[PDB]
Amino acid sequence: EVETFAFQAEIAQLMSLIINTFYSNKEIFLRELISNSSDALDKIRYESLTDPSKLDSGKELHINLIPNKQDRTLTIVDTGIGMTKADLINNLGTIAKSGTKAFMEALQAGADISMIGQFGVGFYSAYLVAEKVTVITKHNDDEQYAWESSAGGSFTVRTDTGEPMGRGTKVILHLKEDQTEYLEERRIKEIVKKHSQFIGYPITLFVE
Amino acid sequence: EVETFAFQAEIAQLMSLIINTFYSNKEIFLRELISNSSDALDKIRYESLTDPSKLDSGKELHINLIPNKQDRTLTIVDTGIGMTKADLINNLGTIAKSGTKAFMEALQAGADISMIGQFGVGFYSAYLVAEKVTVITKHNDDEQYAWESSAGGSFTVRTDTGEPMGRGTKVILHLKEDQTEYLEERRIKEIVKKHSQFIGYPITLFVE
Ligand SMILES: COC(=O)c1ccc(O)c(OC)c1
Numbered sequence: 470e471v472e473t474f475a476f477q478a479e480i481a482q483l484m485s486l487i488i489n490t491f492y493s494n495k496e497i498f499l500r501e502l503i504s505n506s507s508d509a510l511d512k513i514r515y516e517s518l519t520d521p522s523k524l525d526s527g528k529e530l531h532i533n534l535i536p537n538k539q540d541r542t543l544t545i546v547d548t549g550i551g552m553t554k555a556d557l558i559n560n561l562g563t564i565a566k567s568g569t570k571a572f573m574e575a576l577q578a579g580a581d582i583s584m585i586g587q588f589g590v591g592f593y594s595a596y597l598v599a600e601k602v603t604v605i606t607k608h609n610d611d612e613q614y615a616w617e618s619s620a621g622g623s624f625t626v627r628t629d630t631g632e633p634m635g636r637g638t639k640v641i642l643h644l645k646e647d648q649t650e651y652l653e654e655r656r657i658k659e660i661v662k663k664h665s666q667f668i669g670y671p672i673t674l675f676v677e
Numbered sequence: 678e679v680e681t682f683a684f685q686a687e688i689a690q691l692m693s694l695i696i697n698t699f700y701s702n703k704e705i706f707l708r709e710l711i712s713n714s715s716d717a718l719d720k721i722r723y724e725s726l727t728d729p730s731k732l733d734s735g736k737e738l739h740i741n742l743i744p745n746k747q748d749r750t751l752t753i754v755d756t757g758i759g760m761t762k763a764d765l766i767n768n769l770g771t772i773a774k775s776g777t778k779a780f781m782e783a784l785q786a787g788a789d790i791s792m793i794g795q796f797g798v799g800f801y802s803a804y805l806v807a808e809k810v811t812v813i814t815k816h817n818d819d820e821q822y823a824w825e826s827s828a829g830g831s832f833t834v835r836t837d838t839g840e841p842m843g844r845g846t847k848v849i850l851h852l853k854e855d856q857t858e859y860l861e862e863r864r865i866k867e868i869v870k871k872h873s874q875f876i877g878y879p880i881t882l883f884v885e
């Protein structure tokens with residue numbers, strides 16, 4: 470049982486701007502997703518300070534990067550707070566409609582695509598490299614869900630019955646055919662060291 | 678009725694490090710506080726998406742900067758989410774104990790004080806310039822409280838009976854005697870334009 474939703478107009482415009490603008494510095498998508506993971510891990514850590522049972526669903530707070538050259542996917546897994554169904558539908562827990570407005574203004578006023586995360590909409594930079602993005606997520610207060618979108622104006626939500634994850638978010642990037650450099654160990658290491666060296670959680674790059 | 682609490686050891690060490698290290702670039706405190714305000718304004722905006730009555734306590738989302746040369750105070754007011762008493766006691770809603778550990782590591786590994794906000798403890802940069810900091814805060818789910826600290830290991834919390842604020846946080850910076858440049862309109866404008874030009878809420882600098 471799949472539900473199909475329309476992106477808000479402003480988010481659909483932001484997505485096609487990302488997909489359609491000539492912009493070579495695509496590697497910033499990973500920085501953006503790891504930061505979001507870091508924020509989600511901060512929120513569950515904070516909750517746990519006053520309610521340690523919040524961590525019943527898994528105590529280890531970390532980030533895994535899993536390339537798979539067969540499936541052509543790069544997956545970012547965190548054991549952060551997770552998202553509820555309502556969070557997923559509301560632009561994955563973000564204020565994306567006003568974040569998009571602020572980002573658009575900035576882009577006229579001289580800004581570039583790499584500053585996207587300053588406007589709270591760094592998630593959508595996933596579309597610099599992915600033809601399709603699948604987000605599996607489990608929050609303590611809800612069931613496990615899968616969100617999916619290949620852009621074009623709509624996303625689906627379904628309850629996910631695949632591999633239980635306990636708590637956190639997996640962002641599965643189905644990479645565009647010319648973006649397979651982001652599955653190479655060397656290149657992912659370079660990028661993590663470049664843009665994500667002061668993240669306060671361990672980041673494990675899986676090998677194949 | 679005032680309660681006096683001990684800072685966690687790690688926070689007390691972070692504070693005296695801020696107070697005691699030779700570091701000229703003190704102006705970053707304002708960037709750090711405005712960002713925290715921006716995050717708080719993002720959280721109430723998000724909550725309001727699905728429950729517009731959240732905004733009953735005030736619909737305008739913004740930031741005010743109020744210098745007062747008489748009192749020698751610079752106050753940053755936001756109409757963000759606010760903090761509960763429990764948030765105030767738990768390091769003002771932050772994961773400051775692990776943020777301090779990550780920041781300390783980074784400072785050995787070559788980092789400088791200006792990167793503090795990357796470790797989620799930018800609030801404490803207030804002590805680059807303030808001999809004392811008072812935080813008045815009102816969350817929808819709680820009463821209005823005042824938190825206060827001149828560092829030295831302890832902070833107080835009291836319910837605040839002064840001017841009702843509706844919803845949000847006021848950070849009152851009692852500036853060190855040699856830090857009065859941060860009360861000059863020109864200097865605050867310069868800093869806001871330098872470090873806080875893509876904040877997605879209006880920032881009003883009051884005049885005297
Ligand atoms: C709370 O939201 C999250 O847990 C979360 C985590 C990772 C992400 O890449 C993400 O995109 C918005 C959201």
Ligand SMILES: COC(=O)c1ccc(O)c(OC)c1
Pocket residue numbers: 710711713714717755757758759760769770771800845846848
């Ligand atoms: C939710 O926390 C807040 O609303 C908040 C707002 C402004 C600040 O400067 C701050 O320091 C921690 C916290």
